[PDB]
């Protein structure tokens, strides 16, 4: 995917604060299982994407990530996400009933303004800490590359696009029952 393209003219302090506070609020919604609230942040043209990552020699490093027509961990539209919210808020959704306990620690927020005013490309790092049942702990880490629009909702922003670059090849977790 190559190093994120931060502008030399950094985003204003007012703008830097808004995006961070948006991610802090977002993580709060997810960590407290307010899934309907979080889902309302996703735009109708949302593309939710987490590609596979592989072990390659440096000379073939451009094959590290899976592509548009390869399999992925997530490759979701607004419609497919809606079914997942229905499953995760369902009594018969065994993988999250009883639900897990997660923590999204968000940092390393870099903001880029796009050709379209009030639309921003955002880079952020994270650790997702998942704890399930008695003693299960899966620790995920990675970066998120978002496209965010200024929106007239409770958080002041909506998610237009999300790519999650996870720092794993083989997944050490048995499932991805959580949202990134």
């Amino acid at each position: 995917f190559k190093t994120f393209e931060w502008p030399s003219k950094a985003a204003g302090l007012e703008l830097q604060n808004e995006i961070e506070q948006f991610y802090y609020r977002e993580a709060q919604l997810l960590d407290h299982r307010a899934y309907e609230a979080w889902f309302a942040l996703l735009d109708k043209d949302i593309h939710y994407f987490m590609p596979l990552r592989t072990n390659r020699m440096i000379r073939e490093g451009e094959l590290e990530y899976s592509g548009d027509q390869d399999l992925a961990h997530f490759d979701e539209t607004h419609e497919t996400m809606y079914g997942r919210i229905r499953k995760v808020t369902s009594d018969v959704g065994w993988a999250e009933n009883p639900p897990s306990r997660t923590r999204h620690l968000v940092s390393n927020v870099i903001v880029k303004e796009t050709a379209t005013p009030d639309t921003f490309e955002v880079n952020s790092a994270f650790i997702l800490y998942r704890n399930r049942l008695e003693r299960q702990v899966d620790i995920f880490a990675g970066e998120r590359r978002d496209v965010l629009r200024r929106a007239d909702n409770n958080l002041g922003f909506s998610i237009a696009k999300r790519t999650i670059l996870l720092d794993a090849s083989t997944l050490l977790s048995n499932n991805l029952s959580m949202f990134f």
């Binding site: 094959l63 390869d70 499932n175």
Partner: protein, 433 residues
């Protein structure tokens, strides 16, 4: 040490009973590597994972690392990913193209066929190079799928597969062009015995037709529907292989269930139109009505599993008695419309990836089973495998082989019985079909 008498008592096919120690015992696992994985036909992937000369795929046979690599002559060799000098891994990436392989420890150089061609300082310190290449496995192809086996004495793939081949062909033999593997191979770790995973795709439709996948169904059906409005499939059949412990299960005349998992386009592609009619004409030599066979699951013993109707295929890699790795990829008809290939890709991710709306629930059950088996009393009493006992016969007008009802365990009983035979019989003279 486990006597052949003690092995035979671990699985009772007549009574429909399973000793739960078969899922937890460390001594039984060491023997599984020797007696099961060390001489079984194990899936490594597809021919299209290695199209060109020098293309490779690093994978596993049991817990033995192996290299699948396409040759100059268009054949495929499979050798142990280990240098016979001091044991260093020869091929250190997952996939790609190679002109040669070289051991990073002392520079023992190998060609793409897996032969030791160069030893540094050989003339000064040495022994014949032709004799010291990594151990080679037998390679066999079945309609695009690539299997491998260490034992020179084991039966060939076609013999090993037997009357299960018809049910494989439902996925693999639909078009003259053949199948191609969608790029990318998902990998995730589940702390549970491999036998639970193998059996579930072998015999267990029961879990999907009851409680495990109620929420997965909820994810697929339109926003207007609630779960109580979704028809629960009941009609169907289960196959048990004549030999090998293979098994498949499918629904008959149940289009609604395929609609929920794979969507309107795939359901149209599979049952109606030119491509669906060509598949039935090609599989007429079996007599099966493939356009009516939906929601199919299958296992090729030991650790090869697929969902033929969904084109989802997966390999279980054993990691002790308490752990597996799941390596999953998907297939499509090579000449299928791009719109159909994309729909197959989408719903295979949506339902059957590690974050799939089905898969999540499967591993959730398996984690607790393996957890429960840590206890002494949890292994003191046999498990129930009595479902559909003495109910299957070989004279079914539609489906070939030993055929019973879809919610049965005749396939499972067949799997564990073959497992028992594999562990208790040293010689292929008794085991061969």
């Amino acid at each position: 040490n486990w006597t052949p008498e003690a092995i035979r008592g671990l699985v009772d096919q007549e009574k429909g009973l399973l000793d739960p120690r078969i899922y937890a015992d460390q001594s039984l696992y060491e023997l599984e590597l020797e007696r099961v994985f060390g001489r079984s036909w194990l899936l490594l992937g597809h021919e299209s994972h290695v199209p060109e000369t020098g293309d490779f795929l690093a994978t596993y046979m049991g817990e033995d690392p192996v290299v699948m690599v396409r040759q100059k002559d268009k054949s495929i060799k499979v050798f142990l990913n280990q240098c016979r000098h001091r044991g260093m891994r020869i091929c250190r990436s997952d996939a790609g193209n190679a002109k040669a392989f070289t051991c990073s420890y002392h520079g023992w150089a190998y060609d793409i066929a897996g032969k030791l061609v160069n030893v540094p300082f050989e003339k000064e310190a040495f022994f014949d190079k032709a004799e010291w290449g990594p151990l080679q496995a037998r390679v066999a192809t079945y309609k695009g799928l690539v299997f491998a086996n260490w034992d020179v004495q084991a039966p060939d793939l076609e013999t090993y597969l037997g009357d299960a081949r018809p049910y494989m062909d439902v996925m693999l033999d639909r078009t003259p062009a053949g199948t191609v593997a969608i790029g990318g191979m998902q990998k995730w770790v589940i702390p549970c015995n491999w036998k639970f995973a193998a059996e579930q795709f072998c015999s267990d439709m029961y879990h999907a037709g009851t409680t495990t996948h109620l929420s997965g169904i909820l994810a697929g059906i339109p926003p207007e529907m609630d779960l109580s409005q979704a028809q629960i499939p009941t009609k169907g059949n289960q196959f048990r292989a004549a030999w090998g412990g293979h098994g498949s299960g499918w629904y008959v005349d149940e289009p609604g269930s395929l609609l929920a998992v794979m969507g309107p386009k795939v359901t149209q592609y599979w049952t109606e139109g030119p491509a669906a009619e060509l598949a039935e004409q090609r599989l007429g030599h079996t007599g099966m009505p493939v356009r009516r066979m939906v929601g199919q699951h299958m296992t090729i013993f030991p650790t090869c599993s697929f969902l033929p109707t969904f084109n989802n295929i997966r390999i279980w890699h054993p990691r002790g008695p308490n752990e597996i790795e799941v390596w999953a990829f998907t297939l499509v008809d090579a000449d299928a419309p791009a719109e159909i290939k994309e729909e197959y890709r989408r719903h295979n991710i949506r339902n059957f990836s590690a974050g799939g709306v089905f898969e999540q629930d499967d591993g959730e059950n398996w984690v607790e089973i393996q957890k429960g088996l840590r206890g002494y009393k949890a292994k003191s009493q046999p498990l129930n495998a009595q479902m559909g006992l003495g109910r299957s016969q070989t004279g079914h007008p539609d489906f070939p082989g030993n055929v019973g009802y879809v919610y049965a365990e005749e396939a499972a009983r067949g799997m564990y019985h073959h497992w028992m035979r594999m562990m208790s019989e040293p010689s292929w003279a008794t085991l061969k079909p």
